[PDB]
Design an enzyme around this catalytic site. Structure first.
Site, mmCIF file in Angstrom:
data_model
loop_
_atom_site.group_PDB
_atom_site.id
_atom_site.type_symbol
_atom_site.label_atom_id
_atom_site.label_comp_id
_atom_site.label_asym_id
_atom_site.label_seq_id
_atom_site.Cartn_x
_atom_site.Cartn_y
_atom_site.Cartn_z
ATOM 1 N N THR A 41 -2.531 2.800 1.830
ATOM 2 C CA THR A 41 -3.877 2.425 1.421
ATOM 3 C C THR A 41 -4.907 3.360 2.051
ATOM 4 O O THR A 41 -4.642 4.049 3.040
ATOM 5 C CB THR A 41 -4.186 0.978 1.813
ATOM 6 O OG1 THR A 41 -4.467 0.907 3.216
ATOM 7 C CG2 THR A 41 -3.003 0.075 1.497
ATOM 8 N N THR A 42 -6.097 3.378 1.461
ATOM 9 C CA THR A 42 -7.148 4.279 1.910
ATOM 10 C C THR A 42 -7.829 3.741 3.163
ATOM 11 O O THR A 42 -8.053 2.534 3.301
ATOM 12 C CB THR A 42 -8.179 4.495 0.802
ATOM 13 O OG1 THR A 42 -7.503 4.838 -0.413
ATOM 14 C CG2 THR A 42 -9.132 5.625 1.172
#
Ligand SMILES: [Mg+2]
Lengths: 111, 244, 244, 195, 232, 240, 242, 241, 249
Positions: free
Chosen positions: B31-32
């Site tokens: 995930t970012t």
């Protein structure tokens, strides 16, 4: 030199009946000629219908009571919550005490 | 020859450690997570993929705190990130014990970097599958750092890693070009919320939950605190208004 | 991990053989020939130097024959450095026995200790065995004159006459042909030199190409003599192998 | 306290060991055999601290019997005494040293000779014609110095030992409840029936 | 075929850890167990598998402390090891700090203990998934633990064979069971309906059912046998 | 050799565990039946030659006076487990002045099973032996447990392990009922043994033992087993 | 086969992992050179900052090992910082155990011995770095000592490392052939910095701004690194130079 | 340091290293053990080409563990030396702590346990050795003969062979050993053992060793002349055809 | 995390120790170095092949003092030789000088270095050393001696020999030029003549390294006042002396 021991006074007393038992203790904790506490209980319920008291050096007594309570907890963990019989508790406490045969618990014990 | 990518710490004929690059691949699939260095502090933000609505909201925290002034977020294998954060906490504890002052951000960065790099020297251990954005405020001001599975770390005006790292980076770059004087703390928080919302497009299949923390000299008195409550909703509203 | 590079040196072949032991025996087969002969009044060790050159000094060279104590010597065939390691441990064990019992160590006890040392490497440790075969020539009060051999497996045996190294089959056939039980030490010297001259790979058998030793009783004690180059040349010209 | 005596005559060695075991004010035993047969032709008597004695003696016996089984060969009395001296010299510098004194009597079959060794808890070994450990020495040595001849027979040696034991029973202040007497010669080890 | 599944220290070119994935597959072949919670209680329901008709339906719920417990799906030995670790951590908290170990901290500790096996040569990831229920100073809590190390707090979930049926059941019943506060029987019934939603060609009986409940004014208790008869 | 001892198969199993189970499949047959009047354990001795003295084939061992054990597979690997269980039982009696629970003994035995790998020192491989641990305690009465090298253990009313175990289990399923008596259990064990044995069943190649609350764990001598075999022959002969 | 993955001998008597580590040294595509003055030592290195998100002040391959020793690294920055930490630790330990500052050549020999260890023991991989230590030793004067992944170490009258290494090497050789001395006969260290930058732009064939270079100067009892403003001053004086 | 798992399982449920150790046992010299009515005889085959071998100093295949218990083997002689040293040390230790010599069964179980541990420990290979352990328990006249394999299995035998061509000798023993009537005299047992050896030796008495064990620690290895006496009697009874 | 506890040098089915042969291969590709024993000293020489002319030649010291009477030169991998020289200097003190008060004889120090190398060819997780050494020494009871030590750990005493690329050629030269009546100066002359053929580049004192084990140098002692304390016998020749001896060829 550091003395690792001390005396905290107190007195305990156990009496067995026909279908009951009693364990009593005074609620006084002292050091030398000073009163540390007028209510510091030293008789404890440990589960499995067993009461225990180690009287003498308050630190060693607290350590012993803690170790025995932990011992009953793990006895339940490891044996399908089997009730710890009074003789089994006595033997387990003999081993708890003798583990420090060369650095003893300065307590007299009654369950 | 061939077979260079099967074991760690093995040099390929072009001078590469392919296991580290595979760890980076594992990182990119995460995930970012972003970090923004402002004038007097740092802001960290992360996207939390809400796989189902059975997940308890506001729980399952990703941003971690080291000492009381360092914030760390990571993209990749979350357990490796927790491992690295534990090591960094031990490092900060020992530094405080010996030298009294809390560990400076460059010192902490080098501790983490030496640990990660040592994990690329032996075939008996696996490289770290995380990229880490960390930093905070010390006696020399605000510091932001990013650390890769290779052990390479650098100081950043802004950093991003994960799936939506591309757009985020681009967006971050615009920030650096838009305000060379710097952002304020709350401005950086709102901007991080916007950037997380924008980078969510690369993971638009699942719904996401924003998570923001910050360490500001004036807004948090040098301590690292999660942005929660009204400020969190304000940043979320800024991002949502920026999307439409 | 690292197990892929492990050659697994102490495993069994499907036929019940130790790969490394067999390959080390094959290695020893290319070493210079060494012969031991046990006569009724002495023991003789002879050996061929595989390493030989015009510029090699022989006076100060010891490649095949070594003293273990004052009553036991070894002829080595194979890796000289592994042989020196084993010889040092054997000398130390002999001195340990001496310090403990105030008696010279019986030859078989020393042979068995060194062979157990060899065997240890073929069962545990994951190391290569010692590429060395030994011929022990010794004297003790219990068994008299003794001749033993030990190969990398840790096996040791006792012989009246024996050869190790190169051309063991030919040398063993010649020894079995020409050995008689009642022969004396000089006859054994003659037989050893003849076998070495007949099974050598060089053109002629020269003094510079040989090492020689005799453990004999000549005064009530046993004397261990490592032959000097001049003594080797003299004994060679005496048996009719050289002139001058 | 304990009496450990040894006389090496022309063809044998004789070992006498007090029979009394006493702890406190009580003589717990009056028939104790303070010897262990290390090998068919090597015997060892011992005295010293309680427990240390039998522990050390049986440890030595185990090692000597292991050697004999391993090599199919009986160690000479000299080699056995050297091994025991090494063990005691190592023990004296350990955490808890063995407080044992030993007499080692053997018949070396190779030399066809009787040998008697005296070793103390420090590792002090000597070969003697006659030896004694502890306070008993203070009486016996001089006595043997007067009466011992190197060419004595085993019966003469037994009469000499009787003289020594009589002197110890007369002058020593402790009742050691007699002695067990053992003879080591070319034919092995036997025990004198009554003494 | 695949040279990247030899150990846990090898990343695949894609960035995967195949041994961790095989531990997950060891979970998926394990028996089904579901957990759910409200604001006052937390329930674990466990369909214990049997080797055959003469076999005993294996113990699937383990107590860790008076306020915390777990159910397992996968390699029972690794669940024994991890549960013992959790018991020791709760015990350490209680003894050294006079403090009941928070469920979140227990999840963190399990995550770390599990990650330690996914990065070192020799040894393997644990082949179990754990559902951890507990009531602490923060209320009721349910945690899902995977060998990957990922521990997540949920209102409900299920693990094991065909667990997606119960998972979607709780996804639909979330607004229902979250609001059942102070009625443990209804929570247990919802969990039993969920675990029934994840069984094919089976039927819950007294022998193959295990229940566990912990919540406000309720120590961690396990119901086995006739105790579960009230829930069919 | 191209993997590791603690290596998962793509289907989620431990290679060495499955291989050890396959090795156990090659062992002698061991059957156990748990009733309310006791538990019965029988084993096929399986002599490899007429010269081998069948008395020295110890496939049934006593863990404690109230717990017996039957082994199948690489019986050499069992020895260490038998010692661990004996010390565990005696140590529990020492610490608590009571008999150890059968499930607790089995759990301690299984603690060893997955104690393998490359470490902090462990065994190189799992055990190649499976155990039937029969016993009696006051909490759960009579119990029969199956202990695998996988570290898992189960409880069974009856269980068969070893070579002819598969076909044996089905037969047990047919002939086991909750009200089964001890004598019926002995006769049924002998019957299934005779069926799965590669030779004619007699007292020399089959061993029988039981655990009763009254007399503890007793291994039946050859004469009692031979009488039971004769009685089984008589009972089966009078059927159509 | 496997002789290409661990530091063991190939049948041709070569250690392929060491060669691949040498290859890894050029991964950064950064050149550096070092020259000795009358009483100082200058190290120039390229400063290539591709990302605009980077803090340029933290992008460095020059390290202050001790108060007298500086070290510039050609190779990946993780191995660079590994070697830098080890060198700082070794210098501190040396000063503690022997009561005087560690000489440049002694630290070079220490790092070279560690590199040799890595090439002989199979469990540790070589470090893909080439370390150039510069100092003004109280007994040797201006000193440049370089160590490589193979465990070799050697002192230089001047040196250069990187992809265009040979070109810079040739340039320096030619200048020293022309000047007929083994150093730069200038009293001020600023002029020696100027010389080094001039010859680096001549060898590489590209101009440099103040943000494209890293300059480390070692003088007697001091080692420092120039700031961007001070580097710009040197560039201004070079521009004015004919 | 070296803890590599050398003895592991194969997909067919085999420990290949233990079976290869059994193979190593198959190529060793033959050893036979026969229980008499009041004795145990251990026979052994010597390797050939002993024309220059010194039989005086060479180690014999039958090693004495204790005054009452002996051990012979088949396989790699060095591993056998290691096992014999361990067994002798354990016999002395048992004497020291129990005040009673080892029983043949206890010594056999100890050796088999050592072998099993070597088949279960990392970094070590199994013994390429199988053993025949014979003797009499202390104060007992019932012969005891046990056999141990590299795997750790041990079992009692009325008679048993190990080593090369041990299948032939085992079939011969199965044919000519009646449990109802064991060899009453020592002579009958030694004769049966030398016949069982001669079935495979094909040479003569010079490569055959025979050691008889009688109760109360009476152990004697026959010299080559008694072995030749037995061989000549067997060949004389062979000549009738 | 050192899991390499197994031999990396094992016997091949042919009987070869592969890593040892490959280390010998690495030695044969090394720059030629030779040693010549005279009646009043020993000489050891080698070529200082420098990669860059910017490198300082004095730092490339291929001849190294081990004891005041024992020096060494090599052919092969420089760093292996360097750590071997360090281990040798250390073991000369720990294993001998600190026990007997005197430095070790040439044979004992050579055998210790040989033991180090053999351990390198059998210990776990290590390759053999990629060097061959020529050690020239003098002790009171053995006189002068010259030994050669191989990666295998084998050492042999030579009247004269050479190792490296031109080894074969050099040895032929030495064989046809050596005699037991040789002088230290004549040995230096023969060493220079033998090196002149094995070096393609410039041939002066700066490109050659040469040292001797000759007479004692009281001027090289550093202190005066102990008549028994003799000077060191090892002396490294300066560039000026090498050139002075070169000019008269
Ligand atoms: Mg390496």
């Amino acid at each position: 030199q550091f003395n690792p021991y001390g005396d905290n006074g107190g007195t305990i007393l156990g009496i067995a009946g026909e279908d009951f038992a009693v364990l009593a203790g005074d609620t006084r904790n002292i050091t030398d000629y000073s009163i540390n506490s007028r209510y510091e209980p030293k008789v404890f319920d440990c589960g499995d219908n067993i009461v225990m008291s180690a009287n003498g050096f308050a630190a060693d007594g607290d350590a012993l009571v803690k170790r025995f309570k932990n011992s009953v907890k793990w006895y339940h963990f490891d044996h399908n919550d089997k009730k710890l019989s009074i003789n089994s508790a006595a033997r387990n406490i003999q081993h708890l005490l003798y583990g420090k045969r060369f650095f003893p618990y300065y307590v007299h014990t009654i369950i | 020859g061939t077979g260079y990518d099967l074991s760690n710490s093995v040099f390929s004929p072009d001078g590469r450690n392919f296991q580290v690059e595979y760890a980076v691949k594992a990182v990119e699939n995460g995930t970012t997570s972003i970090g923004i260095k402002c004038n007097d502090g740092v802001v960290f933000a992360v996207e939390k993929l809400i796989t189902s609505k059975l997940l308890v909201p506001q729980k399952n925290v990703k941003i971690q705190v080291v000492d009381r002034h360092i914030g760390c977020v990571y993209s990749g294998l979350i357990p490796d990130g927790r491992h690295l954060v534990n090591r960094g906490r031990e490092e900060a504890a020992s530094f405080k014990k010996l030298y009294k002052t809390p560990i400076p951000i460059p010192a902490f960065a080098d501790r983490l970097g030496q640990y990660v790099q040592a994990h690329t020297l032996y075939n008996s251990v696996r490289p770290f599958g995380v990229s880490t954005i960390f930093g905070g405020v010390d006696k020399n001001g605000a510091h932001l750092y990013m650390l890769e599975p290779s052990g390479s770390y650098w100081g950043y005006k802004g950093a991003a890693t994960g799936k939506g790292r591309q757009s985020a980076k681009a967006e971050l770059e615009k920030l650096v070009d838009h305000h060379p004087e710097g952002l304020s703390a709350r401005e950086a928080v709102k901007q991080a919320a916007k950037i997380i919302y924008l980078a969510h497009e690369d993971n638009k299949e699942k719904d996401f939950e924003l998570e923001i923390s910050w360490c500001s000299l004036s807004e948090t008195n040098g301590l690292h605190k999660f942005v929660k409550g009204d400020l969190l909703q304000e940043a979320i509203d800024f991002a949502q208004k920026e999307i439409n | 991990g690292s197990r892929r590079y492990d050659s697994r040196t102490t495993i069994f072949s499907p036929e019940g053989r130790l790969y490394q032991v067999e390959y080390a025996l094959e290695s020893i087969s290319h070493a210079g020939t060494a012969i031991g002969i046990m006569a009724s009044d002495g023991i003789v060790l002879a050996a061929e130097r595989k390493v030989t050159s015009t510029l090699l000094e022989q006076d100060t060279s010891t490649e095949k024959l070594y003293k273990l104590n004052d009553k036991i010597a070894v002829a080595v065939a194979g890796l000289t450095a592994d042989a020196e390691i084993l010889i040092n441990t054997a000398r130390i064990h002999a001195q340990n026995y001496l310090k403990t019992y105030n008696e010279d160590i019986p030859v078989e006890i020393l042979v068995r200790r060194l062979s157990d040392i060899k065997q240890g490497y073929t069962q545990h440790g994951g190391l290569r065995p010692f590429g060395v075969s030994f011929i022990y020539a010794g004297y003790d009060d219990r068994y008299g004159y003794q001749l033993y051999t030990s190969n990398p497996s840790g096996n040791y045996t006792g012989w009246k006459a024996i050869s190790v190294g190169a051309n063991t089959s030919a040398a063993q056939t010649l020894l079995q042909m020409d050995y008689k039980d009642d022969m004396k030490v000089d006859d054994a010297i003659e037989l050893a030199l003849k076998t070495l001259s007949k099974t050598t790979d060089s053109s002629a058998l020269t003094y510079d190409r040989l090492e020689f030793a005799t453990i004999r009783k000549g005064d009530g004690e046993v004397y261990q003599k490592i032959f000097k180059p001049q003594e080797i040349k003299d004994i060679l010209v005496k048996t009719g192998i050289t002139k001058k | 306290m304990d009496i450990i005596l040894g006389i090496r005559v022309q063809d044998s060695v004789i070992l006498a060991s007090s029979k009394a075991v006493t702890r406190g004010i009580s003589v717990l035993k009056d028939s104790d055999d303070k010897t262990r047969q290390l090998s068919p032709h090597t015997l060892m008597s011992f005295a010293g601290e309680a427990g240390d004695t039998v522990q050390f003696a049986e440890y030595i016996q185990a090692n000597i019997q292991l050697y004999s089984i391993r090599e199919d060969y009986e160690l000479s009395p000299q080699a056995v005494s050297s091994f025991v001296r090494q063990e005691l010299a190592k023990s004296i510098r350990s955490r808890r040293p063995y407080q044992v004194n030993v007499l080692i009597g053997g018949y070396d079959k190779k030399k066809n000779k009787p040998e008697l060794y005296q070793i103390d808890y420090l590792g002090t070994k000597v070969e003697l014609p006659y030896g004694a450990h502890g306070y008993s020495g203070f009486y016996t040595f001089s006595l043997l110095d007067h009466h011992y001849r190197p060419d004595m027979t085993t019966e003469e040696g037994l009469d000499l030992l009787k003289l020594c034991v009589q002197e110890l029973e007369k002058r020593m202040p402790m009742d050691f409840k007699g002695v067990i007497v053992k003879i080591v010669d070319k034919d092995g080890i036997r025990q004198v029936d009554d003494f | 075929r695949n040279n990247y599944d030899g150990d846990t220290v090898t990343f695949s070119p894609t960035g995967r850890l195949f041994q961790v994935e095989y531990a997950l597959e060891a979970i998926k072949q394990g028996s089904v167990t579901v957990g759910l919670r409200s604001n006052t209680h937390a329930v674990l329901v466990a369909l214990k598998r049997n080797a055959d008709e003469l076999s005993s339906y294996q113990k699937k719920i383990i107590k860790c402390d008076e306020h915390m417990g777990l159910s397992l799906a996968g390699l029972a030995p690794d669940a024994r090891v991890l549960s013992n670790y959790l018991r020791q951590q709760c015990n350490y908290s209680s003894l050294v700090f006079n403090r009941k170990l928070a469920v979140e901290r227990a999840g963190h500790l399990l995550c770390d203990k599990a990650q330690k096996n996914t990065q070192s040569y020799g040894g393997r990831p644990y082949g179990v998934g754990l559902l951890i229920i507990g009531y602490d100073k923060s209320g009721a809590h349910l945690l899902e633990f995977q060998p990957s190390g990922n521990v997540t707090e949920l209102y409900g979930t299920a693990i094991g064979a065909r667990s997606q049926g119960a998972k979607t059941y709780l996804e639909r019943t979330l607004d229902t069971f979250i609001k059942i506060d102070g009625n443990p029987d209804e929570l247990i019934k919802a969990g039993v309906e969920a675990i029934s939603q994840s069984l094919r060609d089976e039927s819950l009986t007294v022998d193959n059912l295990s229940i566990a409940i912990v919540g406000k004014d309720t120590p961690f208790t396990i119901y086995d046998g006739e105790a579960v008869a009230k829930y069919i | 050799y191209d993997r590791g001892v603690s290596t998962f198969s793509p289907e989620g199993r431990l290679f060495q565990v499955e291989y050890s189970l396959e090795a156990i499949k090659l062992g002698s047959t061991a059957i156990g039946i748990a009733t309310k009047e006791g538990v019965v354990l029988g084993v096929e001795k399986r002599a490899t030659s007429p010269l081998l003295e069948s008395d020295s084939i110890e496939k049934i061992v006593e863990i404690d006076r109230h717990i017996g054990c039957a082994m199948s597979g690489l019986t050499a690997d069992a020895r260490s487990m038998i010692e661990h269980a004996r010390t565990a039982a005696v140590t529990h009696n020492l610490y608590y002045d009571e008999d150890i629970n059968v499930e607790s003994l089995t759990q301690s035995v299984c603690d060893l099973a997955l104690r393998f790998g490359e470490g902090e020192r462990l065994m190189s491989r799992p055990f190649g032996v499976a155990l039937l641990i029969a016993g009696h305690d006051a909490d759960d009465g009579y119990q029969l447990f199956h202990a695998e090298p996988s570290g898992t253990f189960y409880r069974y009313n009856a269980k068969a392990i070893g070579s002819g175990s598969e076909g044996a289990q089905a037969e047990l399923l047919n002939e086991w009922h909750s009200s089964l008596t001890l004598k019926e259990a002995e006769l049924l064990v002998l019957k299934i043994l005779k069926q799965v044995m590669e030779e004619k069943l007699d007292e020399n190649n089959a061993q029988l033992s039981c655990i009763t609350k009254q007399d503890g764990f007793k291994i039946y001598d050859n004469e009692k087993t031979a009488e039971l075999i004769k009685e089984l022959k008589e009972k089966e002969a009078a059927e159509s | 086969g496997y002789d290409r993955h661990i530091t063991i001998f190939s049948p041709e008597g070569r250690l392929y992992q060491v060669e691949y580590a040498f290859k890894a040294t050029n991964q950064t595509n950064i050149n550096s050179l070092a020259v000795r003055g009358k009483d100082c030592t200058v190290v120039i290195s390229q400063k290539k900052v591709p990302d605009k998100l980077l803090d340029p002040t933290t992008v460095s391959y020059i390290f202050c090992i001790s108060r007298t020793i500086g070290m510039v690294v050609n190779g990946p920055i993780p191995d660079a910082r590994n070697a830098a930490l080890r060198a700082k630790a070794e210098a501190a330990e040396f000063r503690y155990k022997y009561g005087y500052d560690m000489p440049c050549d002694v630290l070079a020999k220490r790092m070279a011995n560690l590199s040799q260890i890595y090439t002989q023991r199979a469990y540790m991989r070589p470090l893909g770095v080439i370390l150039t230590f510069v100092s003004v030793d109280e007994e040797l004067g201006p000193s440049i000592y370089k160590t490589d992944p193979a465990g070799y170490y050697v002192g230089y009258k001047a040196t250069a490392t990187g992809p265009k290494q040979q070109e810079i090497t040739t340039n320096l050789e030619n200048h020293f052939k022309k000047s007929k001395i083994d150093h730069i006969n200038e009293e001020s260290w600023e002029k020696v910095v100027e010389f080094a930058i001039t010859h680096m732009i001549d060898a590489l064939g590209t101009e440099f701004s103040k943000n494209d270079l890293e300059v480390g100067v070692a003088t007697k009892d001091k080692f420092f690194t120039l700031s961007a403003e001070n580097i710009e001053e040197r560039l201004v004086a070079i521009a004015e130079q004919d | 340091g070296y803890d590599r798992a050398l003895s592991i399982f194969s997909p067919d449920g085999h420990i290949f290293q233990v079976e290869y150790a059994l193979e190593a046992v198959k190529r060793g010299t033959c050893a036979v053990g026969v229980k008499g009515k009041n004795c145990v005889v251990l026979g052994c085959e010597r390797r050939s080409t002993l024309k220059l071998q010194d039989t005086r100093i060479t180690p014999s295949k039958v090693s004495k563990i204790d005054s009452h218990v002996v051990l012979s083997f088949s396989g790699l002689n060095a591993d056998s030396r290691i096992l014999i040293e361990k067994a002798r040390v354990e016999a002395q230790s048992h004497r020291l702590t129990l005040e009673d010599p080892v029983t043949v069964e206890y010594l056999t179980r100890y050796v088999a346990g050592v072998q099993q541990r070597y088949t279960q420990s990392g970094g070590v290979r199994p013994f390429g050795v199988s053993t025949l352990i014979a003797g009499f328990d202390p104060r007992d006249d019932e012969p005891k003969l046990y056999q141990t394999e590299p795997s750790g299995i041990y079992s009692s035998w009325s008679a048993q062979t190990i080593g090369r061509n041990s299948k032939t000798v085992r079939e011969f023993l199965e044919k000519n050993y009646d449990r109802k009537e064991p060899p009453a005299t020592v002579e009958e047992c030694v004769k049966l053992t030398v016949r069982s050896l001669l079935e495979v030796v094909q040479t003569g008495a010079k490569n055959i060793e025979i050691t008889v064990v009688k109760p109360d620690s009476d152990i004697v290895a026959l010299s080559s002349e008694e072995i030749n006496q037995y061989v000549t009697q067997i060949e004389q009874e062979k000549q009738e055809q | 995390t050192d899991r390499y506890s197994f031999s990396l040098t094992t016997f091949s089915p042919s009987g070869k120790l592969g890593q040892i042969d490959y280390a010998l291969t690495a030695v044969k590709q090394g720059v030629t170095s030779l040693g010549i024993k005279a009646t009043n000293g020993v000489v050891i020489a080698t070529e200082k092949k420098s990669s860059s002319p910017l490198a300082m030649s004095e730092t490339l010291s291929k001849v190294s003092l081990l004891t005041p009477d024992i020096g060494a030169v090599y052919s092969g991998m420089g760093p292996d030789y360097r750590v071997l020289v360090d281990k040798s200097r250390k073991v000369a003190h720990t294993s001998y000088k600190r026990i007997y008060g005197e430095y070790p004889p040439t044979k004992l120090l050579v055998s210790e270095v040989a033991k180090i190398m053999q351990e390198a060819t059998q210990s776990g997780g290590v390759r053999p050393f990629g060097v061959s050494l020529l050690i020239a020494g003098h002790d009171e009871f053995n006189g002068f001696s010259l030994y050669q030590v191989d990666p295998s750990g084998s050492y042999f005493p030579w009247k004269a020999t050479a190792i490296g690329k031109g080894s074969v050629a050099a040895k032929t030269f030495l064989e046809k030029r050596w005699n037991d009546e040789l002088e230290l100066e004549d040995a230096i002359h023969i060493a220079l003549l033998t090196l002149k053929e094995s070096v393609e580049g410039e041939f002066n004192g700066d490109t050659i390294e040469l040292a001797i084990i000759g007479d004692e140098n009281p001027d090289l002692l550093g202190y005066t006042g102990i008549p028994t304390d003799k000077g060191p016998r090892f002396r490294k020749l300066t560039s000026q002396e090498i050139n002075d001896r070169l000019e008269a060829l």
